[PDB]
Design an enzyme around this catalytic site. Structure first.
Site, mmCIF file in Angstrom:
data_model
loop_
_atom_site.group_PDB
_atom_site.id
_atom_site.type_symbol
_atom_site.label_atom_id
_atom_site.label_comp_id
_atom_site.label_asym_id
_atom_site.label_seq_id
_atom_site.Cartn_x
_atom_site.Cartn_y
_atom_site.Cartn_z
ATOM 1 N N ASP A 160 -37.502 -20.864 -24.874
ATOM 2 C CA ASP A 160 -38.589 -20.760 -23.841
ATOM 3 C C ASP A 160 -39.815 -21.098 -24.378
ATOM 4 O O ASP A 160 -40.292 -20.722 -25.312
ATOM 5 C CB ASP A 160 -38.560 -19.154 -23.255
ATOM 6 C CG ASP A 160 -37.242 -18.879 -22.668
ATOM 7 O OD1 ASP A 160 -36.484 -19.819 -22.066
ATOM 8 O OD2 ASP A 160 -36.873 -17.489 -22.410
ATOM 9 N N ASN A 185 -33.458 -17.704 -27.284
ATOM 10 C CA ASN A 185 -32.377 -17.274 -26.297
ATOM 11 C C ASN A 185 -31.016 -17.056 -27.055
ATOM 12 O O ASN A 185 -30.939 -17.956 -27.932
ATOM 13 C CB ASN A 185 -32.409 -17.946 -24.816
ATOM 14 C CG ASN A 185 -33.713 -17.771 -24.264
ATOM 15 O OD1 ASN A 185 -34.176 -18.807 -23.846
ATOM 16 N ND2 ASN A 185 -34.115 -16.553 -23.682
ATOM 17 N N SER A 198 -30.864 -22.145 -26.677
ATOM 18 C CA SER A 198 -32.101 -22.543 -25.941
ATOM 19 C C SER A 198 -33.385 -21.910 -26.588
ATOM 20 O O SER A 198 -33.297 -20.951 -27.037
ATOM 21 C CB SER A 198 -31.946 -22.708 -24.637
ATOM 22 O OG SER A 198 -31.721 -21.311 -24.142
ATOM 23 N N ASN A 243 -37.554 -23.306 -19.847
ATOM 24 C CA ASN A 243 -36.339 -23.375 -20.947
ATOM 25 C C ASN A 243 -35.974 -24.867 -21.398
ATOM 26 O O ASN A 243 -35.939 -25.634 -20.361
ATOM 27 C CB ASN A 243 -35.374 -22.465 -20.303
ATOM 28 C CG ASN A 243 -34.058 -22.489 -21.236
ATOM 29 O OD1 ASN A 243 -33.183 -23.089 -21.073
ATOM 30 N ND2 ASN A 243 -34.007 -21.263 -22.069
ATOM 31 N N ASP A 256 -36.142 -26.591 -6.450
ATOM 32 C CA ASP A 256 -34.668 -26.716 -6.779
ATOM 33 C C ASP A 256 -33.767 -25.759 -6.120
ATOM 34 O O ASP A 256 -32.608 -26.085 -6.362
ATOM 35 C CB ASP A 256 -34.393 -26.672 -8.389
ATOM 36 C CG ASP A 256 -33.230 -27.737 -8.702
ATOM 37 O OD1 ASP A 256 -33.439 -28.906 -8.584
ATOM 38 O OD2 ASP A 256 -32.126 -27.111 -8.900
ATOM 39 N N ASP A 280 -28.315 -18.270 -26.276
ATOM 40 C CA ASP A 280 -27.561 -19.695 -26.344
ATOM 41 C C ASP A 280 -28.009 -20.698 -27.002
ATOM 42 O O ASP A 280 -27.480 -21.643 -27.240
ATOM 43 C CB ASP A 280 -27.459 -19.904 -24.700
ATOM 44 C CG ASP A 280 -28.862 -20.406 -24.163
ATOM 45 O OD1 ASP A 280 -29.748 -19.849 -24.482
ATOM 46 O OD2 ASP A 280 -28.882 -21.413 -23.630
ATOM 47 N N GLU A 336 -44.429 -13.491 -18.389
ATOM 48 C CA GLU A 336 -43.617 -14.395 -19.244
ATOM 49 C C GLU A 336 -44.348 -14.586 -20.661
ATOM 50 O O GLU A 336 -43.690 -14.754 -21.558
ATOM 51 C CB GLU A 336 -43.378 -15.603 -18.406
ATOM 52 C CG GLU A 336 -42.353 -15.463 -17.020
ATOM 53 C CD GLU A 336 -40.933 -15.413 -17.630
ATOM 54 O OE1 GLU A 336 -40.556 -15.376 -18.936
ATOM 55 O OE2 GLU A 336 -40.292 -15.209 -16.654
#
Ligand SMILES: [Cl-]
Ligand SMILES: [Cl-]
Ligand SMILES: [Cl-]
Ligand SMILES: [Cl-]
Ligand code: NA
Ligand SMILES: [Re]
Ligand SMILES: [Re]
Length: 129
Positions: A52, A46, A50, A59, A101, A48, A35
């Site tokens: 990282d 990203n 957002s 994110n 989650d 959209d 990563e």
């Protein structure tokens, strides 16, 4: 900071990521490698809008506030910039929330594609831990 492999493994162990929710330490080291190349300062935008952030590329759509991702949540209650410290405390605590989650470490694309189902113990081989 750019961490050493065994340097990172020892920190992550001190932070309680060995066997957290079933995931042995090698999983977290592999995921970090792919990563962030072990770089705490790594950021990536990203499609959209957002971003990282940090050693585990957390994110801003859902986990931190960077002030520039509209319609987003900050479920870890931190400025995204805290995930860029050489202290990995904010990243580990928020990764614990993320892993808990539902999808486990599948939440990380690079872990699912590059670490799942490999011998991830190799990532801690020969480390004083
Ligand atoms: Cl392991
Ligand atoms: Cl990068
Ligand atoms: Cl925002
Ligand atoms: Cl799981
Ligand atoms: Na956000
Ligand atoms: Re340490
Ligand atoms: Re330790």
């Amino acid at each position: 900071k750019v961490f050493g492999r065994c340097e990172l493994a020892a920190a992550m162990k001190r932070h309680g990521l060995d066997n957290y929710r079933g995931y042995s330490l090698g999983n977290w080291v592999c995921a970090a490698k792919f990563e962030s190349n072990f770089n705490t300062q790594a950021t990536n935008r990203n499609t959209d809008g957002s971003t990282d952030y940090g050693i585990l590329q957390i994110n801003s759509r859902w986990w931190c506030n960077d002030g520039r991702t509209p319609g987003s949540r900050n479920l870890c209650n931190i400025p995204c910039s805290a995930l860029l410290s050489s202290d990995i405390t904010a990243s580990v605590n928020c990764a614990k929330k993320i892993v808990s989650d539902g999808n486990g470490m599948n939440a990380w694309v690079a872990w699912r594609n590059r670490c799942k189902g490999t011998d991830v113990q190799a990532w801690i081989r020969g480390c004083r831990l």
